[model samples]
Target: MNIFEMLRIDEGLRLKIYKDTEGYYTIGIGHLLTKSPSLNAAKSELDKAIGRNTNGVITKDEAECLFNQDVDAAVCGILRNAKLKPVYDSLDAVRRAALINMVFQMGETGVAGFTNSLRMLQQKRWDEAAVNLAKSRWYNQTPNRAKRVITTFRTGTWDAYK
Candidate 1:
């Protein structure tokens, strides 16, 4: 796993409950406490996946392995879906990358919610796509990141987002 992939979430593995950098309660493998499994056995299964105990910590390499697993699973499912397969094939390189980022940020269902923006991309309307992307609730929530990805969608250059 590359540093960029690790830096994608920046939440290293923890064996015990701790506050996340954003001040949310988090536990093993960056799992937020609020979204924790309701049953003890299920939680135990999650801990088993990281090969950690209630008081054990996973190594950097182990963390990377889990992260890659998560990314691969997510990307695979998103692209494998019937709705996203064609859209993925239709996009240009930069746009495909941008769309992947969008799907990563928002799940496939969330990406599907961007009906107009997706249509613009499918139609090859670069400017309209960029504008539509910037007008989203996500753009309002994460302006810098959204601007970077949206800029890349409009221009072929990744530097525009910078």
Candidate 2:
């Protein structure tokens, strides 16, 4: 099955979904919801044996620890929200997802700071994003993470870190 085969939520509720869980739940961006669930009713329940997509549940407490955002959404939102596209629009789904994840964690501003990085992406400068991604401080703050994100960005492959 495709790694992109994930449970989805309404895009309209994207922000509200994050807020509903007190900002803690993992719903893949380009996915179909396992079932339509009331966002407000999600409860801190990604880890009570009720798996989001059957891998395992994420705990609300754990979510808080991760930051006030679901792992998938948080990661995905960054890239989606970043004011870059056309190139982004032209990207494959997985690559876009990867970029979103990186930007979400890195913060759009931080991601934007890498002027060359954004420009390179726009220009399809894959090799450049790879090099800059490594040379920059992104990987510094999170060991292996920047590398992982960059890898995904370049190759459009899902690493399944969670």
Candidate 3:
């Protein structure tokens, strides 16, 4: 219904920071996970995740806001990491935002692993990039969400995905 709702539903908001796929402390729909090379550092990250709730919790709005921050950062990271930053910049807002969503869920390194997808994107091959993404392990794990991203890639529309 709204921007926050769209993002929250897409991200599957959680109030607490938990270990990511690589066991790094991640929070607020893939927000800050820095300083996590050790237990104490991860604990610090956990502390940061629980902003005010003593029981290590956050509100829906809080989570959504933090998720936006993470998505913003991920979008920026995409430009920094991708060899063809201009290609990324040329994409429309919804397309760029969907890539941000993927980056948020996939992490920078994980997103970086999709070399073929990135190459397709660089070449402005929307259909080929969508196909490349669909073939990724990430897409296999979350077909519905991946379909939404693929749709955005080909159609330039941001659709919600569960």
Candidate 4:
């Protein structure tokens, strides 16, 4: 799906997990949020879709704010939040996209522990970079996103995340 499609969390996907005393339907994160409801996920998806930089954390409070946003805006915020805290050291566009996707899927700890993939990217081996991505538990769990993202480095593809 395109970024807009991915970011768009339809009401169909929004399950009513809460019903207030006054009977208002309360919606928040839970199994219903199998897809992220936070702004970090949304924003990061756009950044990758558009090939822009993703550079920070999608904090808990921002996650709480999901109560107030539309799915598309929330997803954008999620993407922005998922942006890692790395120095950005002028990382290549592909590396940045992949890393953001990593943070989006596995959080900071996973990337911090990603020794081999990080090393391969630092070495500029594009195919190896994709392979390294596939090596992670992150890939095993979210194989579709990993494969979709790895295509960014194939030399003939557009940055789909962008």
Question: Largest lDDT belongs to which candidate?
Answer: 3
Q: What would the per-residue lDDT of candidate 3 be over residues 17-130, giving only the tens digit for each residue? A: 566555666556655556456756655655665554234456667766776776667767877885435556877776776667677777677877777887787677988888
TM-score of every model versus the real structure: 0.70, 0.50, 0.73, 0.47
Report the lDDT tens digits of candidate 1 across residue range 1-162: 232333253344665456554355545445444434344544464467676663434456655565566556556866777777677689776666677666655667888778888788888898988888888888897787787777777885656433
List the global CA lDDT of all models.
Answer: 0.64, 0.50, 0.67, 0.45
Pairs clashing within candidate 1: none
Candidate 4 least-lDDT 10 residues: 4-13
Q: Please provide, for model 2 over 55-126, each residue's C-alpha lDDT reduced to its tens digit, 9 standing for 90 to 100.
A: 333444433433434445544545465555444576777777665555554546566577777677777778
Residue 51 error, candidate 2, Å? 22
All candidates: CA RMSD (Å): 4.4, 10.8, 3.7, 12.3
Give the distance in Å from residue 147's predicted Cα in candidate 3 to where it truly belongs: 1.2
Model 3, C-alpha of 100: deviation from truth (Å): 0.6
TM-score of 1: 0.70
Candidate 3, which segments miss by more than 4 Å at Cα? 1-6, 16-27, 30-44, 50-53, 82-84, 159-162
Q: What is the lDDT of residue 34 in candidate 1?
A: 40
Instruction: Report the lDDT of model 3 for residue 159.
Output: 47
Where model 4 places Cα greater than 4 Å from the true spot, the runs are: 1-87, 153-162
- Scanning candidate 3 in windows of ten residues, the lowest lDDT window is 1-10
Scored by lDDT, model 4 comes in at 0.45
